Amino acid sequence: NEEERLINDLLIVNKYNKHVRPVKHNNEVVNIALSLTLSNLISLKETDETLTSNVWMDHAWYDHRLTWNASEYSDISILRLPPELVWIPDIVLQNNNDGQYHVAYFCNVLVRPNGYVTWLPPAIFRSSCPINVLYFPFDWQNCSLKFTALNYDANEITMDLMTDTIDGKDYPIEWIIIDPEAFTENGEWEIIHKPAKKNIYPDKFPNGTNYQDVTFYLIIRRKPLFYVINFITPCVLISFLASLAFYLPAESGEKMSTAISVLLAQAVFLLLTSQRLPETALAVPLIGKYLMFIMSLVTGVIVNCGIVLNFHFRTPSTHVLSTRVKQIFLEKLPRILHMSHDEIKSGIDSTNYIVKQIKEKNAYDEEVGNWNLVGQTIDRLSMFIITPVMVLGTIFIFVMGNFNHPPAKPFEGDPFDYSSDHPRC
Amino acid sequence: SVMEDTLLSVLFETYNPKVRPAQTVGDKVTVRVGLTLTNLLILNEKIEEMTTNVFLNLAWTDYRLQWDPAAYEGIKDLRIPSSDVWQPDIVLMNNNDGSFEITLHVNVLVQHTGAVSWQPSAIYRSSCTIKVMYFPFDWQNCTMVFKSYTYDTSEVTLQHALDAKGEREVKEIVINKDAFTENGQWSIEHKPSRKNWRSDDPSYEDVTFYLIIQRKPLFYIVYTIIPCILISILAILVFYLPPDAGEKMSLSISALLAVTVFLLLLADKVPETSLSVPIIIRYLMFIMILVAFSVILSVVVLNLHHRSPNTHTMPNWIRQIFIETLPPFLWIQRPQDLKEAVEAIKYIAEQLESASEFDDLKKDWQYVAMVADRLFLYVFFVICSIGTFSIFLDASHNVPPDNPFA
Amino acid sequence: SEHETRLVANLLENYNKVIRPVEHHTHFVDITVGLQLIQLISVDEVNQIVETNVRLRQQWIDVRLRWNPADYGGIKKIRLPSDDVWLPDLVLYNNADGDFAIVHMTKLLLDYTGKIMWTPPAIFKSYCEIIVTHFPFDQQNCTMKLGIWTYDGTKVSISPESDRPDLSTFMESGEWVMKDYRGWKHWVYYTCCPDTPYLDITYHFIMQRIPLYFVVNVIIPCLLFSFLTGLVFYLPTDSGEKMTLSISVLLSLTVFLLVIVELIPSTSSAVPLIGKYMLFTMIFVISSIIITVVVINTHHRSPSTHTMPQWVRKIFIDTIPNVMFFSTMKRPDVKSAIEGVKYIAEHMKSDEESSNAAEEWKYVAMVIDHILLCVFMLICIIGTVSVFAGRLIEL
Amino acid sequence: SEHETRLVANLLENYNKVIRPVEHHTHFVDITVGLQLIQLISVDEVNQIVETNVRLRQQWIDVRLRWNPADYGGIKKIRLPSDDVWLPDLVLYNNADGDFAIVHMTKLLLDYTGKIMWTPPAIFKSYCEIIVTHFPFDQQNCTMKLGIWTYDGTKVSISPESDRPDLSTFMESGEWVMKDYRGWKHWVYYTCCPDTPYLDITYHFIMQRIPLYFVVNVIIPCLLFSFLTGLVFYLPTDSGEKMTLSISVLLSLTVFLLVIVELIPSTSSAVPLIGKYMLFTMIFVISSIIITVVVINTHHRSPSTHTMPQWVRKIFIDTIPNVMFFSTMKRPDVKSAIEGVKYIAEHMKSDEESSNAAEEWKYVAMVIDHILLCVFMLICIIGTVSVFAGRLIEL
Amino acid sequence: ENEEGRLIEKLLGDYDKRIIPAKTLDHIIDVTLKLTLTNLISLNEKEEALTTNVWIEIQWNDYRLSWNTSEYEGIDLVRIPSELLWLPDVVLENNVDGQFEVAYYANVLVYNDGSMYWLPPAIYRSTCPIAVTYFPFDWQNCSLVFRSQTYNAHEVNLQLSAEEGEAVEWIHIDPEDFTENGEWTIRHRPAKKNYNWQLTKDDTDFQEIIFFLIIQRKPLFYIINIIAPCVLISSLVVLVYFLPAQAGGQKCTLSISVLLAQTIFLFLIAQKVPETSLNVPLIGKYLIFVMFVSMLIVMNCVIVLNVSLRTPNTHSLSEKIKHLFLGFLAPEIKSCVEACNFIAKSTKEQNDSGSENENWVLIGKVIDKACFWIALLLFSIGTLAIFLTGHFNQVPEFPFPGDPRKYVP
Ligand SMILES: *[C@@H]1O[C@H](CO)[C@@H](O)[C@H](O)[C@H]1NC(C)=O
């Protein structure tokens, strides 16, 4: 096998020092072109704001020491060398969560006779991307993977986006590469944009490791089905049940029970929702806003049911039905709301007393009925005022949520799509 | 290049990285310790642990790594793997796990004068005690203690790092705006650095970086305080419900159910230390006790409402207090056949009169219940308002000091 | 053994473990790959990850590791550390968050002809496209893709050992059933060049979930709540407990939502079968509550304010009660005294009239309850059958 | 330092770190072992694991590593990697689930006389019997057993640096208070032979739990629920809410049982104090509900079908109300018309008799409620004091 | 100087740790195992994994490491780190995680005759499939399977250690230092050598040593926190039959509230039971039973309320039902007299309607009594049977049914 002789010549006879940059003079720059391939998006668990992803880092550089004349050997046009034997550019994910800066598997490099070296190690990365909870669960996130070369400064090695050719003209690969066949869509997230950028920081200096950067962005949109089915619709329906308290007659002693039970169910939903989101304080989540609004409205419904019951149970022995109340709640509002021989002497005296008592009881009863009508009018007014508020608030909140598409173009000031279909020029 | 190979071979022919670089026996190596905060990941209060992503800006001089650049095509500095040179064992001493050392071993920068510079990265989990008294309206004081695990003050001299154009020391955690993520739950108020000694031990010296961070309580505000306020409103409202509705107990006891549900919600978020009670738990317990007392007074009012002469005799003190005095203060202020037929009518009239007297006494009892219920309404409104306002101002007066004292 | 010590010393004296084991660099190493599934550790529906305990059996020939047994006391096989010889870098292409290659560098068996046998253990965490449409009566098909990472088909070729993975020593899952399993080899070419095939072997296991835990823990309580839903319509309105009962059923279902949320997968790809069933139960209970409120309002209607519409009387008092076969429902001062007695009699006139009208309202409410009870029992049965039997018949 | 470079070069040239540092193989290495407690990370009651952050100071003489300071510029102390020299294999015998030996090979301090000082850090996860009987007012005694794994006392002898662990730089726990701590050395012999002692050093720490978190977060709500369940007996039966109150208290107690199971450890060795109190509260509420049902049944006792037994009348209407001092409880067609009036009067008579009997039943029920209210408040106080007073006094 | 230094430098010189110490062809290395249990850390039902802390004692002979004591001042025992020596690759096979090897690589005690004594401690997480039928009144039968992952039966011979000529066929537990788990008690602990007859003496899986741990749970936590509260709360449903059947009686309130509490208990138990779906646990069976009984009692309360609140106008009380239930089971004068007659007639009618109502109420009460007795019997019998099945779930008297030996020291 001539490969053995060739490798011995390259590494042993030539005294290859893997700790030295491949430059003939110690002022030139080694160019490392890198690209990212997303094998699969594993998770974006929002509780601790971590993006787990399976990616394949593609590396390419030149090493003048790993050059040979293919004819002087057999026609060997390529070699596979372990990375522990050759100089490797240490490019690390800087914004990682768990303390894993490097690739998972240090695979062999591929070397051509002209010194071209390609390295394609796969990696599992757990990067930190903050979560914008503003429109949860109708939100889209903007997560980033930031790669830096911390072993050499910008004067020594230059990071660049890899380039590809279509019709004789090469263009940079300014996006994350996704294989349409192998890639399996995430259960919860849809990828909208996937740009790639080489960032320079002019306020730093070239003789430092914090001057260069290559960042890959993933603008992903949540798929709102689990939350719509299990969280939003049942809460919305149970909340709408609170308006039925106004249609429930005061004689049926269950207005307060109904309203309070609705509030308890909403408290259960609050408990469920609290566990799904991080503790950040940038904004209140959309679902949180809706829960606060609906719980406040249901508390108002409970208070107003209490007021109605207090009115319904007033009696002439404890309250006075003033003329103002009668005019307001029995004439005006119902119209506006379109509402729908001593022994015989003793006997005579006894029957007169009976008649007097019966008349007094009848007056008592009719004024009680007046109080009942006042309560019914208050119920009708409350329903007409609160049901539309509930419906409109719910509709507005959730159509605002449903109108939260990503901007359709990353880098607001940029007219480029960063789409793999339309490379620059 | 070839010249870099030659220079490296010359530098490390007899160089031993295990030996601390001292010109003469007794010399001390000056080590400058700086910290750059890249990301304040977490401040887990259950385990009292702060996770940070940092760079350590270390600098020292190694007299052995000196060369004349004129003889090596003007090579001014080298990037040498960190394991090939002596380095001070600078570690995080107050770590919560067993990870003392750095995570990423970036290769060192060595200059022709012998100046070595090293900026390794790490994900550190330090332990800072949490002051759980104003949680979640609390500010924390979490430190990171750095010193040489091996060498003492007789061997190395710790110092603060220098700024970009080294002229004066940097006595703070450095934060690079280009690479820095705001936590979103914590605001950094102060980030000083200081060297600490120990009077008992003259061989001890460390450089401590202090992070004074204030929490943003919006999440807790919403998810605990707002529902608690609504439940307190319901607890007050129970005293406006008429006893005839048969709904007082439903309202009050359902409010108690809601408060215990919120306690279950909050269980998995409050730190489990016993040095103090967080203010949020105090507010929950205050609301719980207020709701329990509302239940007790609702039971009393219901008992008063359903009294009658057949069971109770109304005492003089109750009548004087609740019917004469309180209402104005509370603004309430309230032929054989013919003989048989005559006897039957007389009996009917007597029965009606007896029923009238009985109903009058029952109405007196019910009026007493009404007055007591109004009094409880006012008392509970006052108590709830005063208590909630007091607790909230106490929470809102908790701010980190202007001077970090460090 | 001194013989074996000498043999191992001679084999590795001039052996370079970075060179492929080929006599000429234009040849390819042929590797026989086999997968032995030992245990199905877990399936993660939310993250789409299937964790398995396997052995990756690899066989190939290293021409440089031959020897003549007669020269070594008759030794015909030896065990060598896998780190001492060239190994193929087989990588789990669809790895989710595990190790890409073999990490347990166990010893390998070497014949005197150079034939090598290597069966390192591994824990494969593979990306598994999970379908939750029929959960928990769901069948999952997902694979393990294997290939040589850095070598193409002209340098290292891999061939499956058998037609399917070896499940001889497979521990039974207790949550899944191995319905079928197979392995296929694929040749993939690229627009570059048709002379550089890229080979891989995909092993797929078809799993059928055992739906007993989820049945008893989720579906049965939902069935009880559904059955209780329609029970409120047989409860008379006189007992002030219709809303109590229906709302308490709703609260029980809402509390049970905790159990469902903590038990069923939280994917958003599709709505699970039990998800649809539980949504149906929720809407069923809410509809029952709404109509119960309507009935309670009807029962308490007062004659003074509301007068019975003619169509209501025609339908609910005359027509429907006839066609309800199951039910048993039917289908000086003397002048003052005299004036007072007349007043009492006329007041009783009026009271009886009002009572009769209120009774008619109560009767209409009762008839509506009976109709609704029939309708809701029927809807419960029909909806449950429609949701479940459709998938259950296929099994 | 060229002097120290030469010293280290000449000091490890012929140094074998596999060999014990003794001049003669019949001598023993005398190691001074000291434990420094830096932090008490956690106490796991369920698994009975105590996690501590410690420094394991070790001192011994290695004659092979001595030098004359005058030959090396006066160097008297050097730092060496601990992996370059012989180290004692100290093992945490009662390791639960951590590392058995030191894994952080920090540098050691070597003196020119051969004296070595090594103080590596460690996280000890030691198994210790947790006694949850007085939880949360429980005191724990958890130990750390250390010894040389592979050498007996005649080859390598360990002796404590002092009689107590070093807690000079201990971090205050916030959950546990360090009552006492000590270290003991033990000689263990075997039936083999009495000339070969096996030595171990055991450090033990007496820890007292700070019972504020658990008190506030568990016990106080239980007290509140006990008080309310006692209160149920003051609610009149006429207000149809006795069952509402009692069963809502039971529901609150069930939700809080959920909370407790979330908080308290899930041990099974013995019943904790909180466990006994929670069970007592549950039984209290259940008995309250049962007796409330009895009172409700007595109150709604129909005089038509039931007649008051003489003993009930004698006890609950005559004697019991008298000893309740603090209470305020009491201690032609004309013929047809005439016959109609007579019928009305006699029906009023019958109704009055029935009402009197019903009122007597209601009075008996109310007296029973008063008695039971006193009894249950007394039981609540007595049980609450009984469950905790013994432990509180013990402290 | 330490003579051990010269001895060890002689022994390890020209020593290859890759080479099995088989003296000649067809020589089989005898490796004897003795497992000592230090702590039964836990048995996690959710993961179906058993965590143990063990000291495994491995003994074998390496003829290359023998020396003549007279030549080394009577030295007959040395300690050599295990990383320098050949070892039989004895690993735990049935591990849930990928941890096959021991935790701490202790020094090997080497005797002058070549005998080698290795006692490495280990933390093992082994697969223990869970029999959930009787949870929490259950006992599990966990096994630790040890075999060589390198060498087959033609190269090594795995055996159980023999002490004083008697095979140690059991896990060794030191009576004094061993601490009870707190949730599990060890009833049997046999050890035996097993063969996979589907394989030949090759394949390295033919032979193995299995150590069994038959452990019984102590269900005190479940009894006090789940079982007893659940039973007490569920028994409350029989009280509904003594409540009045009208508004304010609160039959439905009580019954449905007990059902809601049972739902809460269902949520509480969902977090404890293992997720396997081969059997329904005993506790799950009991919860289903009580929930079904509460549903039936709610139905019966609804039926009783419907019967007791019937009216002559909505329903007709046929005498057949009565027998079935109440059995086996001047013009001014004229106007005044007319008014009096009408008053009497109205009173009569009202009284009659009332009377029919009380008849319906009595029928309801009879149904209450009968159904109360039925429900009390049903609930008592069901609860007693279900929770007596668990009490009789005893560990077998013998570690192996048909084996008479007890496998104890
Ligand atoms: C061991 O060495 C001694 C000499 O020290 C010799 O006398 C003796 O025979 C030797 N033993 C054997 C078994 O050869």
In b/e form, how buried is each residue of B303-338, taking b as 16+ CB within 10 angstroms?
Answer: bbbbbbebbbebeeebeeebbeebbeebebeeeeee
Burial degree of E252 (CB within 10 A; 0-12, 13-18, 19+): buried
Strand spans (E) along chain D: 29-44, 49-61, 77-81, 90-92, 107-111, 115-118, 121-127, 139-148, 156-160, 176-190, 193-209
Closest C-alpha among E225, C51, B309 to residue D278: E225
**For the stretch B119-155, what's the b/e string if a residue is b when 16 or more beta carbons lie within 10 angstroms of its beta carbon?**
bbbbbbbbbbbbbbebbbbbbbbbbbbbbbbbbbbeb
Closest CA to A218 of A192, A239, A242, A244: A192
CA distance C167 to C174: 16
**In angstroms, what CA-CA distances link D124 with A417, B91, B126, D207, E125?**
55, 20, 18, 16, 19
Question: Domain end: D212, D243, D264, which one?
Answer: D212
Report residue B317: phi and psi, to 5°. Answer: -65, -40
E339 contact residues in C (CB cutoff 8 A): 341-342, 344-345
Interchain contact, A128 vs B80, CB within 8 Å: no
- Strand-pairing partners, residue B140, are B213
Q: To test the ligand 1 pocket, which listed residue (E70, E73, E76) has its Cβ within 8 A of the most ligand atoms? A: E70
Q: How far is the CA of B19 from the CAs of B66, D107, D388, in angstroms?
A: 16, 12, 63
| Cβ neighbours around C307 below 10 Å, total | 11
**Parallel, antiparallel or unpaired: strands E49-66 and E113-118:** antiparallel
Comparing CB atoms, the residue among A281, A309, A343 nearest residue B184 is: A281
Whole-number Å distance, alpha carbon E82 to ligand 1 midpoint, is 28
d(C-alpha A187, C-alpha C390), whole Å: 25
Cis before D136? omega within 30: yes
Chain E residues closer than 8 Å to D150 by CB = 79, 106-107, 109, 119
What are residue D342's phi and psi, to 5 degrees?
A: -60, -40
Torsion of CA A307, A312, A314, A319, to 10 degrees: 70
Chain B residues lying within 8 Å of D263, measured CB to CB:
267
What is the CA(E73)–ligand 1 centre distance, in A?
11
Interhelix angle for E331-389 vs E282-308, to 10°? 170
Which residue CA neighbors atom 12 of ligand 1 most closely?
E68
Token output for D135: 């939880």
CATH code where residue C25 lies: 2.70.170.10
- 3-state DSSP helix/strand/coil percent for chain D, to nearest 5? 40, 25, 30
> What are the distances in angstroms from CA D141 to CA A263, D99, D134, D138, D177?
48, 21, 14, 10, 12
Distance from CA of D149 to the nearest CA of B (A): 23
The alpha carbon of A166 is separated from its chain's Cα centroid by a whole number of angstroms, namely 37
* Cβ within 8 Å, pair D241-B292: no
What are the beta bridge partners of residue A123? Answer: A55
From E3, E68, E75, mutation site for ligand 1 pocket: most ligand atoms within 8 A of C-beta: E68
Atom of ligand 1 nearest to the CA of E68: 1
- Please state, in angstroms and rounded to a whole number, the distance separating the CA atoms of residues A109 and C247: 68
Cβ-contact E295, C287 below 8 angstroms: no
Q: B residues 38-77 near D, CB within 8 Å?
A: 47-48
Measured CA to CA, the distance from residue B372 to residue B361 in angstroms comes to 17
Query: Residue B361: which of B313, B302, B303 has the closest Cα?
Result: B313
Using CA atoms, how far apart are residues A200 and A154, in angstroms rounded to an integer? 10
Contact D250 E233 (CB under 8 A): yes
Residue E97 CB: number of other CB atoms within 10 A? 13
**How many Cα atoms within 13 Å fall on the side-chain side of residue A116?**
6
Helix (H) or strand (E) holding A99: none
- Residues in chain B preceding a C-to-N separation beyond 2.5 angstroms (breaks): 334
Residues in contact with A410: Cβ distance below 8 Å, sequence separation at least 6, in sequence order:
A193, A195, A217, A219, A418
> Which of E124, E129, E123 lies closest to E95, judged by CA?
E124
Structure-token pair, residue E303:
């039926």
Q: Cα–Cα distance between A144 and A95 in angstroms, integer?
A: 8
Residues 182-241, chain B, touching A (beta carbon < 8 A): 182-185, 216-220, 222-223, 226-227, 230, 233-234, 237, 240-241
Q: Is E74 in the pocket of ligand 1 (CB under 6 A)?
A: no
Q: Which amino acid is at B321?
A: I
CA distance C153 to chain E (A): 30
Q: Which residues pair with B197 in a beta bridge?
A: B205
Angstrom CA distances, A337 to A308, A381, A389, stand at 17, 7, 17
Please indicate, yes or no, whether residues D165 and D251 belong to a single structural domain of this protein: no
Contacts of A330 (CB under 8 A, 6+ apart): A370, A373, A374, A377
Q: Where residue A109 sits, what CATH number does that domain have?
A: 2.70.170.10
Between positions 375 and 394 of B, the ones with CB within 8 A of A are none
Shared domain check, D200 and D101: yes
Distance from C-alpha of A76 to C-alpha of C25, rounded to nearest angstrom: 8
**Alpha carbon distance C261, B160 (integer Å):** 53
User: Which chains does chain B touch, 3 or more C-beta pairs < 8 A?
Assistant: A, D
Comparing CB atoms, the residue among B270, B274, B348 nearest residue D348 is B348
Residue among E71, E75, E112 whose CB has most ligand 1 atoms within 8 A, to mutate? E71
Q: Are D150 and E109 in contact (CB under 8 A)?
A: yes
Q: How is residue D234 annotated by DSSP?
A: G
Residue type, C145: K
- Pick the last residue of a domain from D171, D197, D212: D212
Element containing residue E225 per DSSP (H, E): none
Label residue D46 exposed, middle or buried (CB < 10 Å: 0-12, 13-18, 19+). middle
Q: Where do the H-state alpha helices sit in C268-332?
A: 273-299, 310-312
Do D239 and B25 make contact, defined as CB atoms within 8 angstroms?
A: no
Interface mutation target, options B254, B259, B334, B348, chain A, most CBs of A under 10 Å? B254
Residue D346: CB atoms within 10 A of its CB come to: 12
What's the length of chain D? 395
Beta bridge partners of E115: E61
Burial C233-263 (b: 16+ CB within 10 A, else e): bbbbbbbbbbbbbbbbbbbbbbbbbbbbeeb
Ligand 1 atom nearest E69 alpha carbon: 1
Q: Is D254 on the interface with E (CB under 8 A)?
A: yes
Q: Determine contact, residues B235/B291, Cβ cutoff 8 Å.
A: yes
Q: What are phi and psi of D349, to 5 degrees?
A: -55, -50
Whether residue D241 and residue B310 make contact (CB cut-off 8 A), yes or no, is no
Beta bridge partners of D81: D107
Residues in chain E: 409
CA angle D13, D18, D19 (to 5 degrees): 85
What are the structure tokens assigned to B120, written together?
Answer: 């390794």
Q: Are residues D234 and D206 in the same domain?
A: no
Please check whether residue A104 is in contact with residue A124, taking contact to mean a CB–CB distance below 8 angstroms. Answer: yes
Burial of E74 (0-12, 13-18, 19+ CB in 10 A): exposed
- Classified as helix, coil or strand, A57 is strand
Domain boundaries, position A87: 2-225
CB B301 within 8 A of CB B373: yes
Parallel/antiparallel/unpaired status of strands E207-217 and E184-188: antiparallel
Start-to-end Cα distance in chain B:
48
* Distance in angstroms (rounded) separating the CA atoms of residues C292 and A252: 12
Identify from D188, D268, D348 which residue to disrupt to test chain E contact, counting E C-beta atoms within 10 A and taking the largest count. D268
A210, A204 contact by CB (below 8 A): yes
From the DSSP assignment, how many helices (H) and strands (E) are in chain B? 8, 13
Q: From residue B196, give the alpha-carbon distance in Å to each of B30, B154, B162, B193, B209.
A: 16, 15, 18, 10, 11
Q: How far apart are CA A371 and CA E292, in angstroms?
A: 45
Neighboring chain C residues of E89 at a CB cutoff of 8 Å: 106-107
- Output the CA–CA distances (angstroms, integers) from residue D54 to B93, D34, D102, D208, in the order listed: 12, 10, 11, 20
Q: Is B2-218 in CATH node 2.70.170.10? A: yes
Which of D184, D212, D240 represents a domain boundary (last residue)? D212
Q: Quick one: which of E232, E370, E369, E375 has its CA closest to E294?
A: E375
D295 shares a domain with D236: yes
- How many domains would you assign to chain D? 2
Q: How far apart are CA B170 and CA B192, in angstroms?
A: 9
The residue whose C-alpha atom lies closest to atom 11 belonging to ligand 1 is: E68
- Contact indicator for D303, D354 with CB cutoff of 8 Å: yes
B71 in A contact zone (CB under 8 Å)? no
Q: Identify the residue whose tokens are 């990756």.
A: C56
Quoted resolution (Å):
2.5
Q: Is residue E30 within 6 Å of ligand 1 at its C-beta?
A: no
CA geometry: angle E230, E234, E235, nearest 5 deg? 120
**How would you classify residue A276: left for phi > 0, otherwise alpha for psi between -120 and 50, otherwise beta?**
alpha
DSSP at E136: T
How far away is chain E from the Cα of D32, in angstroms, using its nearest Cα?
A: 21
CA D379 to chain centre: 26
Structural domain containing residue D62: 2-212
Question: A137 to chain C: nearest residue by CA?
Answer: C268
Say yes or no: D301 and D156 in one domain: no
Number of Cβ within a 10 Å radius of residue C349:
12
C-alpha–C-alpha distance, residues A40 and C100, integer Å: 14
Burial of D323 (0-12, 13-18, 19+ CB in 10 A): exposed
Specify the residue with its C-alpha closest to ligand 1, atom 14: E68
Question: Chain D, 138-197: which have a CB under 8 Å from a chain E CB?
Answer: 149-151
**In chain A, count of helices (H) and strands (E)?**
9, 14
Tokens of E330: 């001047």
3-state helix vs strand vs coil in chain B, percent to 5: 40, 25, 35
Find residues 221-250 of chain D whose CB sits inside 8 Å of chain B: 221, 224, 227-228, 231, 234-236, 238-241, 244-245, 248-249
Q: Return the exposure string of B36-72: e unless at least 16 CB atoms fall within 10 Å of the residue's CB, then b.
A: bbbbbbbbebeebbbbbbbbbbbbbbbebbebeeeeb
Contact D251 E73 (CB under 8 A): no
* Sequential DSSP letters for B304-338: HHT--TTTB---HHHHIIIIIIHHHHHT----HHH
Structure tokens at B332: 């309430």
B210 in Cβ contact with A233 (< 8 Å): no
- Report which DSSP code applies to D215: I
Cis geometry, peptide bond prior to residue D194 (ω within 30 degrees of 0): no
Please state at what angle helix D333-394 crosses helix D220-231, rounded to 10 degrees: 150
Token pair of C318 as six digits: 């005359």
Q: Which residues of B163-200 are buried (b: 16+ CB within 10 A; e: fewer)?
A: eeeeeeebbbbbeeeebebebbbbebbbbbbeeeeeee
Q: Identify the bridge partners of residue C173 per DSSP, sorted by sequence position.
A: none
Q: Which pair of structure tokens corresponds to residue C169?
A: 């020593």
Amino acid at A20: V
Single out the residue of E292, E250, E287 nearest to residue E265, CA to CA: E287
DSSP letter at A71 equals: T
Angle between helical axes of B279-305 and D220-231 (0-180°, round to 10): 0
| CB-count burial class (<10 Å; 0-12, 13-18, 19+) for C171 | middle
Among residues E207, E201, E296, which one has the least CA distance to residue E255? E296
Chains that touch D (3 or more CB pairs under 8 A): B, E
User: What type of residue is B116?
Assistant: V
Q: Atom of ligand 1 at shortest distance to CA of E71? A: 5
